[PDB]
Amino acid sequence: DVWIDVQRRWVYLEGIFTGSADIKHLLPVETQRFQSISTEFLALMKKVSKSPLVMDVLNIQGVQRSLERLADLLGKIQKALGEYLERERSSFPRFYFVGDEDLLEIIGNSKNVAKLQKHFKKMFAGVSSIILNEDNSVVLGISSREGEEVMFKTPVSITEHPKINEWLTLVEKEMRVTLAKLLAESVTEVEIFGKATSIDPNTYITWIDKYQAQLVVLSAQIAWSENVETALSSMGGGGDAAPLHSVLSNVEVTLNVLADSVLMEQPPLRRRKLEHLITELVHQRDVTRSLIKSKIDNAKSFEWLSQMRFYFDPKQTDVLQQLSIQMANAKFNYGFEYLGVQDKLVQTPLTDRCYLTMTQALEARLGGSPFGPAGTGKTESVKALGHQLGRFVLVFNCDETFDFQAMGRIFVGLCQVGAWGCFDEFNRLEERMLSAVSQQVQCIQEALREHSNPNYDKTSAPITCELLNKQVKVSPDMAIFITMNPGYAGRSNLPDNLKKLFRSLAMTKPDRQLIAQVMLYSQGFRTAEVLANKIVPFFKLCDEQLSSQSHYDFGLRALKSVLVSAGNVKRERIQKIKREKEERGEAVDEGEIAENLPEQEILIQSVCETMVPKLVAEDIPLLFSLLSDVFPGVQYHRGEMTALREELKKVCQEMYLTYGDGEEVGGMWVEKVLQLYQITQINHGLMMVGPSGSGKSMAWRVLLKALERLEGVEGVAHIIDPKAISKDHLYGTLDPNTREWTDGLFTHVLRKIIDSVRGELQKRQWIVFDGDVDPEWVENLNSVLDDNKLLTLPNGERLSLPPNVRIMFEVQDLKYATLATVSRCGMVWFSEDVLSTDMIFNNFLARLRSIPLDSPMLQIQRDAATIMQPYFTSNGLVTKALEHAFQLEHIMDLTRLRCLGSLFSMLHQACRNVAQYNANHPDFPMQIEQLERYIQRYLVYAILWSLSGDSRLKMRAELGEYIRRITTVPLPTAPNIPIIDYEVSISGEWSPWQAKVPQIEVETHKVAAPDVVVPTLDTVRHEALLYTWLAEHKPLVLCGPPGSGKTMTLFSALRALPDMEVVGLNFSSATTPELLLKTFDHYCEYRRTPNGVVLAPVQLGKWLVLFCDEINLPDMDKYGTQRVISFIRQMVEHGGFYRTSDQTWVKLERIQFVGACNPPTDPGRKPLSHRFLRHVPVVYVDYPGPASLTQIYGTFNRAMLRLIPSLRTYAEPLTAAMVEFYTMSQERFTQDTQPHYIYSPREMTRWVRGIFEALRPLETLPVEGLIRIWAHEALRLFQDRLVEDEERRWTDENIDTVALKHFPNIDREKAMSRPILYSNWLSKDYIPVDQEELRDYVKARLKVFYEEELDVPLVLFNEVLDHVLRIDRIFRQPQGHLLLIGVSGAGKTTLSRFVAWMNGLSVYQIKVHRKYTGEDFDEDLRTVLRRSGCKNEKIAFIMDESNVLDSGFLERMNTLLANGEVPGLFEGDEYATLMTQCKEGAQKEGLMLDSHEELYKWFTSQVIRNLHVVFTMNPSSEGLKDRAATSPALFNRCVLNWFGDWS
Amino acid sequence: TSIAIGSAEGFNQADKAINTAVKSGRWVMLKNVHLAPGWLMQLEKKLHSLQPHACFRLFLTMEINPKVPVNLLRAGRIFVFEPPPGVKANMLRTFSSIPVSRICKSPNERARLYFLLAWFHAIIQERLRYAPLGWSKKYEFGESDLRSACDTVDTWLDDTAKGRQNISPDKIPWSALKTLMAQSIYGGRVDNEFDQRLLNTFLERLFTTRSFDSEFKLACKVDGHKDIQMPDGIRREEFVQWVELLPDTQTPSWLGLPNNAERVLLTTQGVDMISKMLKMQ
Amino acid sequence: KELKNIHVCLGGLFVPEAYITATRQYVAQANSWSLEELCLEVNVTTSQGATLDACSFGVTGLKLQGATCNNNKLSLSNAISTALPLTQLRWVKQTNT
Ligand SMILES: Nc1ncnc2c1ncn2[C@@H]1O[C@H](COP(=O)(O)OP(=O)(O)OP(=O)(O)O)[C@@H](O)[C@H]1O
Ligand SMILES: Nc1ncnc2c1ncn2[C@@H]1O[C@H](COP(=O)(O)OP(=O)(O)O)[C@@H](O)[C@H]1O
Ligand SMILES: Nc1ncnc2c1ncn2[C@@H]1O[C@H](COP(=O)(O)OP(=O)(O)O)[C@@H](O)[C@H]1O
Ligand SMILES: Nc1ncnc2c1ncn2[C@@H]1O[C@H](COP(=O)(O)OP(=O)(O)O)[C@@H](O)[C@H]1O
Ligand SMILES: [Mg+2]
């Protein structure tokens, strides 16, 4: 327990000390200590490696003492390194925004400054890189992402300050002082531009170009504030001529100059500066107009103090404190943080109210809480206010993983740096986390309040707060802001104490008209006012008139996207007119171009490009009428993107897809593809919404390929099923102990793209989320899908979204996504009408004609496609059949692609049948006429079995009759036999299925055996259908009532496929994909082929069929998703999954899935997802009818009664007595009364098996004894589970009635003596026993039991004798498990132990205590399995319902009851020990087994034969219903005995 | 020592603080203990077998939810904190919470400003009972809003009055106070145009120079033809004494609402009372 | 054309704001006006004694809370609610006055 820790510590410390070759210069003494440690480590490696034996090294003295000394040294040096990192973070606090490994990277790479250029983006607001000279010895300045640079007035020399922290601090200080000096110069110039009647455009543009985008806006604000203050000071006399009009006119003329400037072409940086200046001066004009209208003549009037005012004092020695920003009574000093070129917001009344409220909160030294619906600009407003004060604002997208420690360290970083923390979705945290974080917030605010006191002096002790058990310095510039959407899903409730720490503000209705007007005016739109007054009411009326859809969003974000697209479209149209003028003539006048420009047409084009793609069919005319009314007389026609259209044509031809233009076949699909392309061009977050199989996947794949072939940029798509894995595996985990971050799947992909080791940034990267969307996982992408384009992790790491990456979602609905997600994504709606059925038929036929199925095979496929072409047309046989089948009743929801894929697979099987016929007859290959007849008849047959295979008999007959009415294919001519009763022979003729159903004679010793099937019409039909579906490896689902024969049919069909090995998985309510992963680990292996990781079965040449027993049992979350179902859908549709150990795509090979389930209407069963049912054909296996049951059990009875010739004539009546009573009970007792009242042929199978066991030893027996055995087995089958007394009385009376009806001439008393008791205790055979002799024998055995075992005296009554007889019956059967349901203290455990002792079973009970966990249960399970499977010891495992502490108990018990083994129970050294003991046990038995697979099979057989599980539980009404879903095997694999209370 | 419940470190801190205080005699407060219903049981068992210092006190602040253990409720004395029953009770609580030295300061008008603040707070908090009509939704107009308004009044009065004993009512920054209360303090919670209009209603009606006249009416036609009269006093004790002599006949007309607004509610509660008197029979 | 002269109950419609938008659109299209420059005027009259012009739409079931309407003028009342017999919504050009 010491060697591994020391080894790991030495490895990572050696990595740290070796990667950082310069770390020794700052850490000398510990460098020498680590050199000594490394010498010691080399000594150990030279000593222990010589002798590779544990015994050879544990005999050497001085090893453990030296190891303990080394452990202490490693701990001490690690603590010293941690303290050093803390101390170096104390200086230059920006290092609190980088990780420890990153901090060490900067520490050791101080000599080379090239590696440090990637860390400034996370330590500074807008500093992306630092400018250095050719020597890389002095820091000349800083640069931003946009390329704007600030040249330091005095460059920082790294040579004079070699230490990293010192020159970094000098760089930051020089940044601030240089920004202050440049601001002073810009203010000096803009003052000259101020107080002027006219402004020269050239000088104004020169000044704009000279200074940074931040500084020009700041200087304009300062100059305007000074002008207004001077005017108010002059007017303070009262009743005087106003020079405030002069200030207003100065604003107006400057706005005119700026508006003229933006009309003409400008450099992008200058254009952004002009836009910011236009916005700011529009706000200034509005404020000045408000002041003039209000007749404000005093500078101390609140109409002027309520505004943001800027005061510049050149007389201040400190240039940092030279600028003051004041709002109401709140004063701030400009932080002078370089912000680069941010996007300025429009200062709307709401923004002003937000500024006032947040500044009031800041003056009170408490946080701000803007709340409201999504898209009200709560976050942006906080960031805009932070940038207005020159603050460094960091946005943290918060979720429930932001625990106390993560929030504490974020607060520590904010305190040290002095930054603003905008915590978006703060309510996504847990309520207990919110309460815990409230204490830290209160401590920080108290520290700030103490700082604000005038009694404090900066020369005294600095203000510190207790954060994470540490004293942390709190800067006065810190602020905490929390933006939350009240009412949304996935949000928690804030505690009152936390709420009192923030000033709340309702941001619900943004001033959309003002934003639109200002944005359009800044882009150069003439008549922006009318455009805004038309486009904002248009959005309001679109929200009102249009239908309510979950993917509809007509909020600010939608308008914002529309306005940005309108500006881009205007620029593109101007460029197009420019090139047209260049190619035709030489006269270009940009003013003329702006004058005659159809701005309303541009707005219509923007709206159509952004709003139209998300509209449903019924809402398109409404929106177009709204456009025609709001913008009358103007029309827009979408441009024909031809250059992309030929590429789409080529890709569709290469991908066997149908292409169309406009109103042709597939035209709507191409329109949707073009809309998706436009949304990609305009949005970095996209979503493709529509019902399953609407062509979304093909749309985006074809778009990606066409873009690759058109632009030349290679497109890489990463497809992730977000709900197929846990959110921890999707985003990442933070270790609560070691604070170590493990990346998730999306995080790993994004980080790999950002690093771009293999040129990832040069490729078009599309991360598609193909799965269900709920607020639990998708809200973590909010900051990703927002302007922030940033992924924030709880460990403080922030990853910026590269411009070449698009985040896409492919979903079937958005009924669980909140508006927060809907508003942050461009929606493309794919209706089912987009993908027509003709398109699917064309794709299938093209694939059949092109792709070989195994060239003679391709020729056969082409001939078959030519033959079946006439039936796959619009208004054809298949289309009308599908339309009619959609009107029938099916056991599951009917989707078009499920039936179509079933039909296509059956047609592929037909082609393979023709190929097999040709191979079998080399001399006489199948001719065109025989092929035509066979293909037509098989097409009819496959249509029938694919469009009605999941329906009852009457639906199948109805579909057959409809097909017969509409088809022209020659059909069977029977007047009454339905078409579903025929098959198609390879000769091309209809043949009845009854010819494949021969009356067999089962062997006497094989009566009612588990693998014995009596051939019946449904058996031969379902067997053929399952063989057809399995031969193609197409996943299939069998639906039907429990015990209908789904497992029996599937095993019978698989017996005809020797190359397939079946593995049973039993799903339950808490089944999760880890069960599938354990099955893969046990039965398959991963290998790293050159194409990637491939998971394939260990047995080469065999296909692994994973048979799921109850596929619809797994619980749906509160958002209607089953994780295991999504996992299977991913493995089927994508042919693989993701290994979360290293986030690696694993491709499945030679693995197929088969599912079984009860109808979804049954209790505890959920309907399957439509995206899952699309790929799995569903076959409905119903209960055998009276004729089929009579045939199946009649055969078993004849085989049974062949034992006694004198009874051979009673097979026909007995079977009838079997059939009638079973029917009656099935009608009498249903699941409506009690959950366990389920009766199926399985009960009758047990009936025949029990009577056969009773009849095996007897040499002869009269009819009365046979009837007695029949009645006894009926009692043990149909009466033991009954709850009420009247039900059991009904069972007795009708057993007598049925027996007398079917056996008239019998002795009633001799066969129906009411105490019907059978036992093999008194005699060797299972003959009937008398009650009194049985009581005496039980009394004697109980005396012996008291002497040898538990000595609790018992009182014998009749019920005790009946119960012990039943338990003895169950313990004498293979895989015989019990479920005794009754009141506590009724003797269930005592009777079970007594009967187990009589039968030689060893009683095992788990000793559960308070500290009992799942691991203890697993260990006990391993013990019992080893004892009963390796030592051949019969064990009665007695378990009580109170012994269960978790659902994992029920999962493991369910798997053990159903299969006899737990796939993941023995893993690791335990599996090797189990294999060793199993080999020893097999050698003891006399079987020589070599491989682990067959040995594990022998172990499973031993466990099945030996272990008997007795489950005892109290009779709860809802408890039994819950157990029926949590553990299905407790009700299908266990014999249920209702002891109840004592009568 | 105040500790917020919810984290493991929180539980460790709570245990350490209680163990220290039961010997030293200090006080321990634990906040939001309803978020850890399980831990409250072990806390109750720990408290039961304990003989702490004479001056030791343990306060557990919680929300009224059924997850709190019954045994813990029986083990301690319960105090329910809720909106005051009426305008008079609300104003009395407001005047008791604010220190006397705060109201009695350099300007004599500060007392009347605080009285107006208390009346305003009482009216808006009492209109919350008639949720559909008094407002549009259950806004959380609470004690923090009152503190913020008091701080704003203090700051702006001190700014306007540079320590002068008396200032004219017209010189009081009424516009600043009205705007800050309608946009930042009380208007921050308001997310409706009509609720904002009603808040502006109350602020313009109450906060003005006319509030310093002897004929000022706080409310009109409360019952019949009489109306609530603005007290003529200039000291805090006189305002409190006026609040004490309120008629104890409060009607929704005191709030500006119609008198029948309570008619349904006062009916239901009455019936509810009967039900409770029948449940305990 | 008959659908214009019917009186609907706004509370009995699944989406009454869609009805308001539809009436606004009908008035805008009839007079060839722009959709965004239309404002709404309300005239309360008796259901039987009323006339609807090209811009007026009839609405029933509106209840005035705490006030009574006489001659299209509102007065405070002590009644909980007063049933407005018929309401004429008439779309007109915005005057900005
Ligand atoms: N342009 C096309 N021409 C012909 N067939 C097409 C075309 N586009 C798609 N298909 C076919 O129609 C079906 C559409 O499946 P696709 O995966 O594209 O739909 P989807 O809506 O993304 O499905 P899901 O919602 O299940 O993920 C497939 O059989 C596909 O091969
Ligand atoms: N005053 C404004 N001027 C311009 N754009 C604005 C303004 N307010 C908000 N926006 C835009 O509206 C959207 C609001 O985004 P965000 O702040 O994330 O919203 P919320 O906080 O409501 O979730 C962004 O596109 C933002 O740029
Ligand atoms: N033709 C048949 N031959 C033999 N047994 C049959 C036949 N049809 C139905 N059965 C009986 O039906 C039952 C089906 O059990 P099982 O395969 O577990 O059903 P399910 O898969 O529906 O749960 C068994 O008892 C089986 O013997
Ligand atoms: N038939 C009986 N006569 C007398 N005592 C009995 C009888 N059955 C159970 N007990 C007593 O009940 C206790 C055992 O109950 P147990 O079998 O564990 O109950 P459960 O039915 O809940 O499993 C012992 O005290 C035992 O002597
Ligand atoms: Mg798809």
Question: Which two tokens mark A1129?
Answer: 């859908």
A996, A1021, A1242, A1244, best to mutate for ligand 3 pocket (most atoms within 8 Å of CB): A1242
Q: How was this structure determined?
A: cryo-EM
Angle at A1157 between CA A1156 and CA A1158, to 5 degrees: 145
Q: Which residues pair with A59 in a beta bridge?
A: none
DSSP state at residue A1278 = I
Please check whether residue A659 is in contact with residue A648, taking contact to mean a CB–CB distance below 8 angstroms. yes
Measured CA distances, A927 to A853, A865, A934, C77 (Å): 20, 15, 11, 95
Instruction: Select the residue of B2, B179, B189 nearest A302 (Cβ to Cβ).
Output: B179
Q: Environment class of residue A976 by beta-carbon count within 10 Å: exposed (0-12), middle (13-18) or buried (19+)?
A: exposed
Beta carbons of C65 and B133 less than 8 Å apart: yes
Measured CA distances, B59 to B3, B23, B40, B69 (Å): 10, 16, 13, 16
Ligand 1 pocket residues where CB is under 6 Å: A 652, 657-658, 666, 669, 690, 692-698, 810, 812, 830, 835, 839-840, 842-843, 1171, 1174
d(CA B64, CA B72): 13
Please check whether residue A393 is in contact with residue A407, taking contact to mean a CB–CB distance below 8 angstroms. no
Which backbone phi and psi does A1381 adopt, to 5 degrees? Answer: -110, 120
Tell whether the torsion through CA atoms of A164, A169, A175 and A178 is positive or negative.
Answer: negative
Measured CA distances, A1266 to A27, A1172, A1241, A1260, A1274 (Å): 95, 51, 21, 10, 12
Beta carbons of C25 and A534 less than 8 Å apart: no
Quick one: CA torsion of B250, B252, B258, B261, rounded to 10 degrees? Answer: -120
Residue A381, by phi and psi: left (phi above 0), alpha (psi -120 to 50) or beta? alpha
Please check whether residue A1200 is in contact with residue A1004, taking contact to mean a CB–CB distance below 8 angstroms. yes
Cα A34 to chain centroid, rounded:
46
d(CA A1460, CA A1471): 16
DSSP string, A613-650: GG--GGGHHHHHHHHHHHSTT--------HHHHHHHHH
- Sheet strands (E) in A1400-1473: 1402-1404, 1435-1440
Q: Which residues pair with A810 in a beta bridge?
A: A688, A770
Q: Is A377 annotated as a binding residue?
A: yes
Cα A58 to chain centroid, rounded:
50
Question: Which two tokens mark A1431?
Answer: 């030592």
Tell me if A1244 CB under 6 Å of ligand 2.
no
d(CA A48, CA A51): 6
State which residue of chain C sits closest to A536, comparing Cα positions.
Answer: C36
d(CA A95, CA A110): 14
Q: Is A1041 annotated as a binding residue?
A: yes
Q: What separation in Å is there between the alpha carbon of A1387 and the centre of ligand 4? A: 4
Q: What separation in Å is there between the alpha carbon of A1047 and the centre of ligand 3? A: 7
A1358, A1390, A1541, best to mutate for ligand 4 pocket (most atoms within 8 Å of CB): A1390
Which residues of chain A does C31 touch, with a Cβ-Cβ cutoff of 8 Å?
none
Q: Which chains touch A (3 or more CB pairs under 8 A)?
A: B, C
In Å, how far is A1024's CA from the nearest CA of chain C?
A: 52
d(CA B27, CA B59): 8
Tell me the HSE value of A141 on the side-chain side, using a 13 A CA sphere: 12
d(CA A374, CA A355): 19
Instruction: Select the residue of B143, B151, B189 nearest A364 (Cβ to Cβ).
Output: B151
d(CA A1512, CA A1506): 19
Pairing of strands A1103-1108, A1151-1157: parallel
Q: Is A1045 annotated as a binding residue?
A: yes
d(CA A1145, CA A1140): 9
State which residue of chain B sits closest to A441, comparing Cα positions.
Answer: B4
Question: Which two tokens mark B195?
Answer: 């609720």
User: Which candidate, A1314, A1335, A1318, places its Cα nearest to that of A1327?
Assistant: A1318
In Å, how far is C49's CA from the nearest CA of chain B?
A: 32
Beta carbons of B7 and A503 less than 8 Å apart: no
Which of C64, C76, C78, C80 has the most B C-beta neighbours within 10 Å, making it the best mutation to test the interface with B?
C80
Q: How many CB atoms lie within 10 A of CB B32?
A: 25
State which residue of chain C sits closest to B261, comparing Cα positions.
Answer: C80
Query: Reduced to 3 states, what is the DSSP secondary structure of residue A1024?
Result: helix
* Contact status of A629 with chain C (Cβ, < 8 Å): yes
User: Which candidate, C71, C60, C66, C97, places its Cα nearest to that of C82?
Assistant: C66
Please check whether residue B44 is in contact with residue B72, taking contact to mean a CB–CB distance below 8 angstroms. yes
User: Which candidate, A1331, A1300, A1336, A1302, places its Cα nearest to that of A1314?
Assistant: A1331
DSSP state at residue B185 = I
Q: How many CB atoms lie within 10 A of CB B142?
A: 15
A698, A830, A1126, A1133, best to mutate for ligand 1 pocket (most atoms within 8 Å of CB): A698
d(CA A1117, CA C53): 56
* Resolution value in angstroms: 3.4
Angle at A269 between CA A263 and CA A273, to 5 degrees: 65
**Residue type at A1056 in one-letter notation:** A
Q: What separation in Å is there between the alpha carbon of A436 and the centre of ligand 5? A: 43
Pairing of strands A732-734, A479-483: unpaired
- Sheet strands (E) in A1026-1102: 1036-1039, 1060-1065, 1084-1089, 1092-1097
Q: Is A650 annotated as a binding residue?
A: no
Question: Which two tokens mark A1180?
Answer: 């409905």
Please check whether residue A775 is in contact with residue A490, taking contact to mean a CB–CB distance below 8 angstroms. yes
Which of A366, A378, A401, A432 has the most B C-beta neighbours within 10 Å, making it the best mutation to test the interface with B?
A432
Work out the end-to-end distance of chain A between its first and last CA atoms, rounded to an integer number of angstroms: 60
Q: Is A1155 annotated as a binding residue?
A: no
Measured CA distances, C37 to A510, A527, A694, C40, C68 (Å): 21, 16, 40, 10, 31
Please check whether residue A1124 is in contact with residue A1111, taking contact to mean a CB–CB distance below 8 angstroms. no
Question: Which two tokens mark A600?
Answer: 């309303």
Please check whether residue A1334 is in contact with residue A1321, taking contact to mean a CB–CB distance below 8 angstroms. yes
Length of chain A in residues, anyone? 1543
